[model samples]
Target: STGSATTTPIDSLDDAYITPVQIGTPAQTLNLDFDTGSSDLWVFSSETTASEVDGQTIYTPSKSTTAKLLSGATWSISYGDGSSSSGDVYTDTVSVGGLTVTGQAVESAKKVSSSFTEDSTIDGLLGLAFSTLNTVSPTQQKTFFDNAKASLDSPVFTADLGYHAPGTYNFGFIDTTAYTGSITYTAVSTKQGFWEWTSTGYAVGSGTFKSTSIDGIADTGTTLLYLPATVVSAYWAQVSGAKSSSSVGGYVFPCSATLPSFTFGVGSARIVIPGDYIDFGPISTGSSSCFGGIQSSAGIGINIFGDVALKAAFVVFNGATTPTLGFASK
Candidate 1:
């Protein structure tokens, strides 16, 4: 019965989405972030020190008969935000959305950065990017999607992220009913293991289009939209009281500021991100000042269409013959 399945992505802190993944023999369930930026199915596990494990549920390999150690193998990963995780590997049965991949490589964390350990909402990361970027040592690993692609009628998945709410992550097939109009297709370059695509142009506050082509990756793991310094500056300059403050956050503005819309041009297709979404949340709870979600991609040397930009559109990570990307309004 080779076909499609669906998974409900849980909304987390208005910043990320987590999906339930069953690992090992009896299926040690964990909430994992379906990250499109990297390729590694790593999780907090028995290998992790008690002190290192915060509120995250650990996957005890010893508790599952299906767990097998890949002797001498290891894995480590670092993110653009400086968050990182490292550990050993285990081969096990991993299931998601009723699709299972046997002998899937699972990185069980022995150590994690404070940034990762402190965030207890997510137990691990299920990277949906190209498998060429997996961090396993000696030999690389295949992602669940890679292992399961053959059985899927169409090697495709869709991410329908939302604003401060839960969304759907559809696998193997696209839910045409989930989106409106036609999905605009774009050629993607997977040279860097990312869904890297070039945009025709963009504009701020419904202004005239600026012919500034943006080359970026659609990274669900990341929370904010990162653009070129010039673009970031241009958008902020339009905000009367906006100023970048490292001490406070990237960029901040008075709560009363009337922000404008930001639109991206994708091969003639345009998806405008509402300015209200750009406000993100306040610098801190109960604070009047808010942090700007659009920051400089210079920090990572590449623009990142993070959740801030992704939430505004219905995205298709088409892994078909050409591995193209498609976007439509939800």
Candidate 2:
């Protein structure tokens, strides 16, 4: 859910989906969209035309008297939904909460479509997920985590909010008060930014099954977990006549009934997904029922562990020290 604003005036002209973060001292505020799908920080700019800048927040260097533009370079971003924007690159002092990171790289979009031009609430998007897809260069690289990493109490970063709120995204040090288990660390691969591991087996209910263990990757960018069809079909077989219904195009059972516990083995580590997460709602199409935790994606190249799995655990992307992932209870 988007956060409700009690003290701040709600602007209907703005897209209610914008997330806000503090930039530098004295608290310069910037509206941002917290995207787990990609890693980059981009904002609207003053150089944008009046038509292109309509209904959006354009950051003017003259307004701040401190913002700096990066000359001779251009950048553009395209979304999966067919939306795109192009702008010039710039460097500036950026901060979040009270943490300040200087010389942060940002893109100032001059030509934007109605998707961005028609909204004034959400100024830009701040990518807080993994860094495997960052577009920044070697000589001049800037990331939200790269800038804010030093000011944080812990060498880690976290997303503690619902992630869909306008001006409600919170970053910086992780608060470990709610966690109750020991933290786990996994070696990271240099090939891609994805966290990769091997699953020993998969189970549904209390029954154990044998299958070929395969390597898996965890991604915040993806919304759903994609598993092999053979294993997924075997798992549903043990769910007490849990049949594949045509209503939702997947496996569906009584919403009131409790589903069996399912666990995936990560090498020596065994991580269990709760039953509540297994409960999936019916979709509009009457093809098949959707199962919450597991689904069939036989042809899908890589197995993806999305937010449903990550939300249950605290994941730390340790890029500051080394390219490694530290998992702990949150």
Candidate 3:
């Protein structure tokens, strides 16, 4: 039997966007953002009357011979970024990488706003990050992994993005042919849409922050690393005369010197963020400084380890067979 759900932190890439898994046979492709923060697979539809839905990829159910809308139930979602969309719910046969899953619940956005409409490259969003946050009804709650698991030969998934160019992201069973060593596991916490974990402590360069270790959650939706003010100040103090710039909203140091490496201790697991992640080049502010990875966020209850740190590791959300999470070799 599968054990308790284990939590694994996924480093998110700014460019780690996923295209929609087109409905119907001979699947049509649509580019979308793969969001772990929320569990809702939505796409703009050509039938939408809203002008903001223009230029977004709209799935034409009429064009899809196999598409089936679910009971005409209306749905709407508002993101924290102040963007919102609403549409009718649908159930259709969806395919991802030749793996076919039937009766998959999807939302077709009939109305959209400037945030989604302005991006021509984004056709929709694939919410594969977690299942607890799925938008589907209790009776229909099933994740992409849940549907694809039976068809996948290996029961693993891999996401590979180009450092600069367009990269490929794949699901199914992880390709162990490319990976070596044992998988690392962490315990999962039942809470909000976030994955919470306890931190043993944090380190900057060679010095350690001896204060009570901070407890926090790892969120892939956020773009920056946010920590308590005390921890931020303590970290910057060891960085050899680091100074916070008003314009940058964070600390910065001279580029001539190499920025120290920082690591976070999660139980026995140690995650390290290299110097390149922090070294921001000269800006209009005329300060040739490297940006500090840690930032001050007052009164923020949880420390968010965002995309800046997650991209370095391979993250797995095993909601299909079990509620566990595992980390793989990058």
Candidate 4:
């Protein structure tokens, strides 16, 4: 069996991508961030404090006949940005697109940070990373993808994240028409519990491609492309009037500057990001300076090939006995 769904950016900045999923017996639909960066399928629920509820949708387990309490189970997770949520657990019927998984562990949020409450568009997150990263205590739970993989026609899923537009996430099989040209495959190191891989190198604008290995995780949850400081600095150096600003918290340049395209290597394949995509909207609504979509990952400890980079290619998270990543130009 297979399934697919359209994912859209929640805002103009394309800060996060969301897809609809059905939970419980009657199917309460909710928009959730399809995050490949973490492993926890948590949701806002009746248990959540009213203060944390804002306008987001919540899952009412009591309303679902199939919902069962996971005794003695609990979960808590925090992101790099400091946003976090903790909650009790339940097993319920969870469906994504047309794929249904019975007895899927669903974490019901009891507490959430201000960041989540402030953004009413996102109800919660559906983690796609390896189950080893799950935060559920005592008995770590499997992600939606992990739980459904065994029954899928092919134990593989593809992420085609968009740029201020709608993209598709296909489960079980790859739609050949979804991408142009053959995909370049690379071994993934799941030792860190992430879909991590090494890129051959990168090039600024049309400059020569540098021959070096850059390790990074492909995170749909992250908004920007974070690379080594040297690479980030080199890209910014090509722009006029670009500077690292303390007030804005990143490299910013004149919105009027002609930005250069960025290219990164996947095997011998060169995926290019158009300049327009790099000119992330102005820091302030009507400001003249714009923040660069590409930023330095020096302080973060791990480089992230987030939506900014993933938008340029069709990515495959192949879940074989030994996992591997596939990148293709679309």
Candidate 5:
């Protein structure tokens, strides 16, 4: 048996990939963010505070005949963007793209930050990260992927994301039709439960690709690319009106500035990001300035190969022993 699904982009913001998930006996459906950066399968449930439940559909355990309580157990999670959620626990049947995992632990949100509440579309979060199995606590964690992988035909999943169009996330098997060109595979270090890798170097725009050797995590939940402050400074230097601003919290430039593309080395593969994508979204409705999609990851320690850098290639989150990440031109 295999499982796969199409991901829907919520808005033009290029924010996150949302997938549909069915939970419990009666099959209450919810749209969740299939986040690879963080680990933990949590949902907006009956346990959530009323105020926090905005446009999201709530998952109620009591309504599901298959639901079982995990008494005395609870969970709390914080994201890189400072978004957070904490909740009680329940074990139930969870299904995704026809793949079903019975007796899967589902965290029911009891508290959430404004970052989550304001984005009313997300009902829960499905963490497809390597850290989902970390023993931070003996029995507090096990993501849907971890629970279902032992029996999968192949321990693999592919992320084929697009800018303003629909994309697909195939699990348990690779779909050759989704990607073009040969896939360039890279060794991934799953240290600290992240898909971290080293890029030989990068070039600002159509410049030369040097041997910079940057270490970073591939995070699907993160919306923009974050590199070293010094590296970001160099890239912006090429754009005449670009400047890092504390007010916008990232590099912002005149909306009409001619931008340069970015390129990163993966194996012998050179993954390039278009100049248009670097412009990100507008800073304000009335302002003629926009925020850059790539910024500094200094304070955060490791650089993040976020979505802006990701959408340019078809990414593979290999669940193999060493856990590799593959990139291919689309």
Candidate 6:
């Protein structure tokens, strides 16, 4: 079996991508963030507090005849951004695109952080990371991809993200027409429960390519690209008036500054991020200063090739016995 779904950005900055998922008997649909950085298919539900509801859609398990309580099961998760959710678990028929998985575990949120409540557009999160990251107690639950892998035409999924446009997530097969040239493959390390891999090197604009190993995870959940301080500093230096601002909480520069493109290596293939991509957006509604899409990962402890980088290429998440990642220009 194979499945495909269109994932659209929620805001102008392409802050996050959302895809529709159907749950339970009558197919209660919700727009969920297809996060590849975490492993927990959680949602705002009837279990959630009324004050935490905001304007988001809530999954009502009681209304679904196919929904069953996963006795003794519970889950809690905290994201890098500090937002969190916790609640009981349920098993129900869940569908993505045309792919269906019976008895899929769904965490019903009884409590959520203020940040999640504030984001009215995202109803929940559908995790695509390794099952090792699952937070279910007593027994861990598998991710949607994990459960659907066996039935898929191929044991893989692909991400074709766009710049403020509708992208796609395809399961079981790679869409050759979605990319250009050939794909370059690299070994993945699931030890960290992420689609983590080592990038060959990086180059700022048309500068010399650095032949060094830069390890990071391809995280669709995150909005920006984060690298070492040295790399970020080098990139910012090229832009006039660019500075690391504590007040802005990141690197910001004159909105009128001409930005340089950023390029990274996946094996011998180079994926170049256009200059416009590096210019994230304005600091505020009417601010003349703009925040950079690339930021220093010094304090985070891990570099992340987030959506800012992922949007520039097509990526394959192969779940073979020995997992491998594939990158291609789009």
Query: Which candidate ranks first by lDDT, i.e. highest?
Result: 6
Instruction: Give the per-residue lDDT of model 4 (tens digit) for 1-330.
Output: 999999999988888889999999899999999999999999999999999999999999999999999999999999988999999999999988899999999999999999999999999999999999999999999999999999999999999988889999999999999889999999899999999999999999989899889999999999999999999999999998999998898999999999999999998888899887787888988999899999999889999999999998999999999999999999
Displacement of the residue 291 alpha carbon in candidate 5, Å: 0.6
Task: Record all residue pairs in model 6 with backbone atoms less than 3 Å apart, i.e. clashing.
Answer: none
When 1 and 4 are scored with TM-score, the better candidate is 4
Tens-digit lDDT track of model 5 for 1-330: 578878887787777778899999889999998888878889998889998878888999999999998877778888877788887888999998998999888888999999888887788888888754422234656878888888788888778878777788777888888778988888888767888899878899877777878999888778889999888998999998888899888899988887899998998788888888787767988788889988999898889998889888899888987789999888
Query: Which residue ranges in model 2 land beyond 4 Å of their true spot?
Result: 1-19, 24-37, 44-62, 78-85, 110-123, 128-132, 136-140, 150-154, 159-174, 199-201, 209-214, 235-260, 278-282, 285-300
Give a tens-digit lDDT track for model 3, residues 80-152: 5578777777777766655667777777887877878877667776665456666554343555665666666
Whichever of 5 and 6 has more TM-score, that candidate is: 6
The positional error of residue 108 in candidate 6, measured at the CA in angstroms, is: 0.6
Residue-by-residue lDDT tens digits, candidate 2, 1-330: 111111111242111234556543344576776565556777777777677676666566556545666667676667543566777776777765545667777767777777777766667777655555665544335467756656665555554322222222234444456345765667655465455655567666676645557666655544455678777777677666577655555666644456766676544555566666565544434524435556665656667666445544556555555555555544
Note the clash tally of each candidate.
0, 13, 11, 0, 0, 0
lDDT of 6 by residue, 14-40 (tens): 889999999998999999999999999
Distance from true location, Cα of 4 in model 3, Å: 26
- Ranking under lDDT, best-scoring first? 6, 4, 1, 5, 3, 2
Model 5 lDDT on a 0 to 1 scale: 0.85
Q: Candidate 1: lDDT over CA atoms? A: 0.87
lDDT tens readout by residue for model 1, 55-102 = 998999999999999898999999888889899999999988777889
| lDDT scores in order | 0.87, 0.57, 0.60, 0.94, 0.85, 0.95
Residue 292 error for model 2, in Å? 4.2
* Model 3: per-residue Cα lDDT at residue 48: 71
